[PDB]
Amino acid sequence: GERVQLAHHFSEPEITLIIFGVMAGVIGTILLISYGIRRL
């Protein structure tokens, strides 16, 4: 980034990839729940 920044374990791409993976996981969970409902 700019100036003096605190150093994290994950970089920007690593953290954004893990957050997008979590988002994909919860989206898939909700979609599978919706598929389970309206059928049984």
């Binding site: 980034g1 700019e2 003096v4 605190l6 994290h8 957050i19 989206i27 919706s34």
Partner: protein, 517 residues
């Protein structure tokens, strides 16, 4: 385009199949001088609010978000929307409610010691999840419950706000540079006048009025019977660029007086090089971002989602009305997904999330409308005009020697033109006029010929009360609640209005396609 299919992403897929076959026509239909004139018009109509809102954002965010970020975000999102959106006639940019939200979040982040940019990164992250769920469940089908009532109320209120703000800017110039017997002749001019200056406010008024008068005169010249017709139509298409050029030359040849000019940032750099870079870490910049605000970002993200959803979908409803003769189709699922996802992604880069603004989109559609021999014939539905507008907005930093000679007053008169010309297709505005017109004069329209005059005026006055309520709400600190009060006009039409109006009267007054029941 508003039906519910029962299949996941069913609205999104049908949205693509509806518009994407017309992609070849969406390039070739732009080969006309009307498209170029519309490009020149909407370039200024999108660039000037970008600069103004970016300056306000930088003043309120301490330059955490500023003019350069807004310009680049507008350019990238407009290019991607023109290349991929199902309704390429929408203009995507910053709006007033978004500025009200950026200030409100900054205060909460400042109060609890949360970095503002990182919270936006998490709000935008929550924005992507929310829009995916809405699109996957066809949530855009709820737009069908927004009838002509809410659409015209919102459009009239937004046009009135736009006109009011344009006049307010001229009033501020008079306040900054008051007319007075004597002036300090040696007043520092850097970076803004540090004191009142002679002839400034009056020249600003003469420029604004000059450009508004020339724009209106050329608009009348289009519909007049003077000159070879094809030549008259060309001149009428370029009427706003001709007025802008004339008044810019007028202020150019007056060298001694001072008029505020367009100012673009020096380069493609962040507004504050100390605060942040181009990429924002979701875990924090200088201090670690707390875990609770990662989950608590959903509620401001929710409010942002209602704001952008309401503005964009109502704008799509207004622009894609059947009376405007759009035969290429409009996509209520694809554009919402694109706008909200692009905003959520731009939040990660420290950039504003945008929305489909009403005034700019209506002006863009109107500039591409071909009038018949009073009756709308067709609209030049293409992707090139919005793409070129976004490209010019992104290139505006390198066009500083050109933009630095353009006064704000000329753009103020252009804004008043846009505000007064955005009221043409609104039946609420027409019925407001019928209040001051004797009944014999009233036109041959279904809500006049099949509804009693006092019933029609009662219907108009109920809408007027809603306009006053919404304008009052916009004037309080709780102006972010405007989407909810606007939504409350949907139960009013569907529940309360049938309690006092017959079904025939509601069909005539609140008509989807202007039909006599």
């Amino acid at each position: 385009p508003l039906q519910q299919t029962g299949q996941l992403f069913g609205g999104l897929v049908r949205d693509i199949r509806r518009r994407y076959p017309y992609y070849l026509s969406d390039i070739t239909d732009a080969f006309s001088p009307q498209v170029l004139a519309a490009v020149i018009f909407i370039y200024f109509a999108a660039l000037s609010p970008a600069i103004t809102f970016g300056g306000l954002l930088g003043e309120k965010t301490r330059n955490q978000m500023g003019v350069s970020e807004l310009l680049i975000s507008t350019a990238v999102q407009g290019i991607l929307f023109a290349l991929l959106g199902a309704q390429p006639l929408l203009v995507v940019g910053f709006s007033g409610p978004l500025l009200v939200f950026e200030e409100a979040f900054f205060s909460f982040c400042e109060t609890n010691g949360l970095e503002y940019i990182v919270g936006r990164v998490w709000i935008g992250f929550w924005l992507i999840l929310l829009v995916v769920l809405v699109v996957a469940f066809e949530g855009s089908f709820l737009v069908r419950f927004i009838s002509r009532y809410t659409q015209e109320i919102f459009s009239f209120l937004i046009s009135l706000i736009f006109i009011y703000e344009t006049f307010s800017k001229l009033i501020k110039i008079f306040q900054d540079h008051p007319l007075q017997k004597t002036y300090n002749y040696n007043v520092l001019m850097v970076p803004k006048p540090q004191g009142p200056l002679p002839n400034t406010a009056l020249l600003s008024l003469v420029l604004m009025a000059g450009t508004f008068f020339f724009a209106m005169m050329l608009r009348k010249f289009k519909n007049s019977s003077y000159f070879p017709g094809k030549l008259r139509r060309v001149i009428g298409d370029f009427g706003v660029p001709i007025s802008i050029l004339i008044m810019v030359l007028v202020d150019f040849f007056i060298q001694d007086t001072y008029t505020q000019k367009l100012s673009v940032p020096d380069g493609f750099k962040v507004s504050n090089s100390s605060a942040r870079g181009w990429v924002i870490h979701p875990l924090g910049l200088r201090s670690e971002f707390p875990i609770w605000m990662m989950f608590a970002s959903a509620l401001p993200a929710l409010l942002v989602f209602i704001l952008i959803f309401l503005e964009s979908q109502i704008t799509t409803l207004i622009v894609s009305k059947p009376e405007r003769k759009m035969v290429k189709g409009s996509g209520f699922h694809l554009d919402l997904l694109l706008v909200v996802g692009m905003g959520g992604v731009a939040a990660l880069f420290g950039m504003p999330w945008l929305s489909a603004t009403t005034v700019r989109s209506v002006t863009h559609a109107n500039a591409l409308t071909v009038m018949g021999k009073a009756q709308i014939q067709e609209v030049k539905e293409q992707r090139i005009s919005g793409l070129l507008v976004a490209v010019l907005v992104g290139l505006s930093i390198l066009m500083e020697p050109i933009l630095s000679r353009i006064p704000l007053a000329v753009l103020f008169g252009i804004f008043l033109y846009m505000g007064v010309t955005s009221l043409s297709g609104i039946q609420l505005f027409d019925r407001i006029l019928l209040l001051f017109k004797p009944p014999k004069y009233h036109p041959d329209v279904p809500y006049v010929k099949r509804v009693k005059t006092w019933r029609m005026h009662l219907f108009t006055g109920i809408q007027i009360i809603c306009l006053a309520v919404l304008w009052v709400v916009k004037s309080t600190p709780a102006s972010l609640a405007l989407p909810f009060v606007l939504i409350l006009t949907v139960p009013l039409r569907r529940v309360l209005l049938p309690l006092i109006f017959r079904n025939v009267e509601l069909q005539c007054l609140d008509a989807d396609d202007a039909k006599a029941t």
